[PDB]
């Protein structure tokens, strides 16, 4: 359009269009939506039964290696009727390309863990257990990482209010370092910044 606006290219917008066309053509048991990101990236929606095989198809092949697990993460979403969102991410070292694996889930429904396929996701899966409560099945070592020994909230989800319940202190009443109910010395003001007029017309929701 002008300077200070990002120039795109149609090369990678056509190749990454054409490449992952046949990842839905040759495993149509699991893959249920594929969409191309406008900034030349790929997302591929996978039913949670296909957590191990579509990785295992990728893990070794001649046409799509994807041998580096960069980032396993997890997002929680109320109002979805299935809460969470597990997002895998991989790296084709032979090819310089990215693809993300977005598998939805719920709390009580377990997920078959990707420990045997990648040994990178040993610590990326003990962590998500602590922060949301997703129970990854048959994990070789499931423990308590990044939290204290007394938290029972799984705090990175939307039901845990920002400051905790267990604000700590010391007393000389015996020797110990003891807990207490939470007691702030300031309100933590909550500002309101969401301004009207619906500035974005392209992403507009259907009218209803």
């Amino acid at each position: 359009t002008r300077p200070t606006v990002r120039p795109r290219n149609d090369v990678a917008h056509k190749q990454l269009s054409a490449f992952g066309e046949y990842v839905a053509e040759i495993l149509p048991k699991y893959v249920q939506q594929v969409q191309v990101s406008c900034f030349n990236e790929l997302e591929i929606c996978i039913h949670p039964d296909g957590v191990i095989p579509v990785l295992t198809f990728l893990r070794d092949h001649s046409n799509a290696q994807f041998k580096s697990l960069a980032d396993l993460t997890a997002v929680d979403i109320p109002t979805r009727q299935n809460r969470f969102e597990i997002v895998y991410n991989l790296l084709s070292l032979r090819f310089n390309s990215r693809i993300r694996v977005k598998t939805y889930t719920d709390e009580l429904t377990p997920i078959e863990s990707s420990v045997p396929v990648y040994k990178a996701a040993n610590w990326y899966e003990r962590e998500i257990w602590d922060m949301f409560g997703v129970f990854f099945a048959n994990h070789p070592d499931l423990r308590r990482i990044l939290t204290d020994y007394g938290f029972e909230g799984h705090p990175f989800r939307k039901d845990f209010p920002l400051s905790g319940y267990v604000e700590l202190r010391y007393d000389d009443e015996v020797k110990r370092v003891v807990a207490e109910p939470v007691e702030l010395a300031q309100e933590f003001r909550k500002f309101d910044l969401n301004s009207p007029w619906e500035a974005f017309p392209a992403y507009r929701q259907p009218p209803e």
Binding site: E152, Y165, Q186, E187, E198
Partner: protein, 123 residues
């Protein structure tokens, strides 16, 4: 397989402490801070909790407080999935209603009459 069909109501417990039975939630549609006129602030069912005491911190005047919830708004898409979250964690609630205005009948050019009463001036 082992899909073991049955029906039992999903209620979870253990994660908060005592604020299950003490606090009734509140689901409402927010309605248009009237000093302006943009209607993007609507269109999302939210929930919000009760307000409790705010005393004064007797060294400055900072309105310090307990009541650790006190700042939680969630944004739900609809009524159908509004109440479907107050039960799964299991606290009480009360539901408001969405209000949409009269359709309505306005017509410029009706401000000038022969025998009617709507006739404006000073413009």
């Amino acid at each position: 397989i082992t899909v073991d069909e049955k029906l039992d109501i999903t209620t979870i417990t253990g994660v908060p402490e005592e604020h299950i039975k003490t606090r009734k939630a509140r689901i409402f549609v927010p309605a248009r801070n009237n000093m302006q006129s943009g209607v993007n602030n609507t269109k999302k069912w939210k929930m919000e909790f009760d307000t409790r005491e705010r005393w004064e911190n007797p060294l400055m005047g900072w309105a310090s407080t307990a009541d650790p919830l006190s700042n939680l708004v969630l944004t739900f898409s609809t009524k159908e999935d509004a109440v479907a979250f107050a039960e799964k964690n299991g606290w009480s609630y009360d539901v408001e209603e969405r209000k949409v205005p009269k359709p309505k009948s306005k017509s410029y050019g009706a401000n000038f009459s022969w025998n009617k009463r709507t006739r404006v001036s000073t413009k």
